[PDB]
Design a protein around this ligand. Sequence first.
Ligand SMILES: *[C@@H]1O[C@H](CO)[C@@H](O[C@@H]2O[C@H](CO)[C@@H](O[C@@H]3O[C@H](CO)[C@@H](O)[C@H](O)[C@@H]3O)[C@H](O)[C@H]2NC(C)=O)[C@H](O)[C@H]1NC(C)=O
Lengths: 155, 52, 121, 88, 89, 135
Amino acid sequence: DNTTVFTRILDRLLDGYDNRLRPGLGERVTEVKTDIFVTSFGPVSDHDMEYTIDVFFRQSWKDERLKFKGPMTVLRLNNLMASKIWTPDTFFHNGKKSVAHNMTMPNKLLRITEDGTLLYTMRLTVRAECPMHLEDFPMDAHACPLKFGSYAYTR
Amino acid sequence: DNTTVFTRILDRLLDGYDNRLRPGLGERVTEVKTDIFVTSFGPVSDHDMEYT
Amino acid sequence: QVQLQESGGGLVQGSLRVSCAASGRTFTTYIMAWFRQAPGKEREFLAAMDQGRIQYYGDSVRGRFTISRDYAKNSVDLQLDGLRPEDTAVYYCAAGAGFWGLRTASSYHYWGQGTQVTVSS
Amino acid sequence: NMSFVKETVDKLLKGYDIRLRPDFGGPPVCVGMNIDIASIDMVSEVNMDYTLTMYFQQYWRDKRLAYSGIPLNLTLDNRVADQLWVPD
Amino acid sequence: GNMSFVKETVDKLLKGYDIRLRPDFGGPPVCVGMNIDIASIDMVSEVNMDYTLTMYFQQYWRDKRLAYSGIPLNLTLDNRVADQLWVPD
Amino acid sequence: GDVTVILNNLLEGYDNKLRPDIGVKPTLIHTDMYVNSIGPVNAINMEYTIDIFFAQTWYDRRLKFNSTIKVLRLNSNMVGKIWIPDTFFRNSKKADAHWITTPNRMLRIWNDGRVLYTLRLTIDAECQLQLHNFP
Ligand SMILES: *[C@@H]1O[C@H](CO)[C@@H](O[C@@H]2O[C@H](CO)[C@@H](O[C@@H]3O[C@H](CO)[C@@H](O)[C@H](O)[C@@H]3O)[C@H](O)[C@H]2NC(C)=O)[C@H](O)[C@H]1NC(C)=O
């Protein structure tokens, strides 16, 4: 069948896999290439010193464990597979209460290229601290940061 | 290991224990001695006629 | 009057530490940065520290210099290691909110008088 | 027969790959959507948003779930939505 | 460091690890060190009589069952392993 | 335990996906309700709150058991194990059950196959107010 081959490929990839261990653990540093697409810069709340931002947050990284040879190059795989493999635990340093939208389903997409270059993007609403200097109010200006990084893993 | 004795004890305790049924079902009335320690008596909201 | 007092040695043959203490205004919420001015060159950004203990460094001096902030006594310190002779210049300390910047001198409103640093071979 | 319906649905759910869409290597899967708007609650000018309750229904075709011998629509319990693939 | 070796060591560590039992059930008390990094205090509300507090809360404790050998490095595991490991209540 | 073996026999071969009498006749569910308190009528959102005990009785021949025990008086554990009607309130803007200390749900299964399922609910239901004659 045309789908049982993909099922066997997925089973082979997941067999022996341990999502608790990052790629190249103990032998190489994991380079995560990231980018952000801001779908809407939300309102700024002066009272809370807070601003909201809605983003497609994309990450990508190599994972030698998830290389394969198959009929098609990149598997536009279901978002369910994101929980079955290691993913970066990126968190926002100045975020206050961020939302990972999951209507109708968890708004994430995962794609595995044949070499092993995983792409993994998610839809988020992050509200983050934007400290303000109101000396020149209402004629003031601000530079609201948006800062993110790994929570558990060091350089 | 030194602590495996307690693990075996708990395994024997849970072997066959059906939690869907109350203790003493069909034999006695389950007596529950309940009580409360109020750590903090929260504010009383009059708009909702409620208190925490 | 807002004033930023810089302190540190002037001549070296080596490692050095230069401190910059603020007065008349608390810069705990501001970004504190260091700049370099050689003879006949424009101001070059060296390093910066943010309210969140977050460090930024210039490429020319990445991995050599180290920036730190003491919020209690309201100062920023720069530790210089592995000096090489063309690093001779006057070093400025600045504090401000980074608007259009965090790397441009124009984004800072407070500046120090500058401390000269020279390396002898 | 309830038993025959049971073994039919068990065979349908047996060996079902949720990770793969209905035609993974095939042409795109068509999904028809229709909405029944129950109400619009608060059209807020200050928040620049509106609330909307609806019955939102999707319609697609999965050959893996095709069955036979049952002239009925099997309105199964909603917990099988977890076991079935659905559009994201 | 070998990924297969790390996987087998973690499997051996978590094989038989009874989460219900605290790290030294019959022995002396376990000592838990704690420290905090306060990121910010947001809203000291006089109306609600409370204050918000965002923080990195870090706990430290020694468990004999989770001691391994042959991997001279600190295994920074994925956060989901806490559901299998015992932690203070 | 007699009740334990009875429950195991009842759950042997049972599927909660299929309603009882899938292809025989419609399932008749008799609804009842005890309104604890109709909450305040919030005119701004045109809604009112209501707390209820909602009970549904029906018949499931799969749960017929023969024993000297005439009724099993179970708790919320078996609610997810047996088939339950997916009744929902159409005009609800916000509804939720009660989960303290445990889920406020109750199950009873008689030897003739009658299932009674009760639960506590709090419902914020819309009510389109015609305010021409206010107050
Ligand atoms: C795994 O984590 C432990 C605990 O953090 C690391 O142990 C510490 O490693 C450092 C660097 O080798 C040792 O040296 C230094 O100690 C002084 C005095 O405390 C301190 O000022 C330095 O910043 C530095 O930490 C330190 O003594 C040692 N201490 C302990 C408690 O173990 C360990 O190095 C980490 N694993 C690896 C492979 O680095």
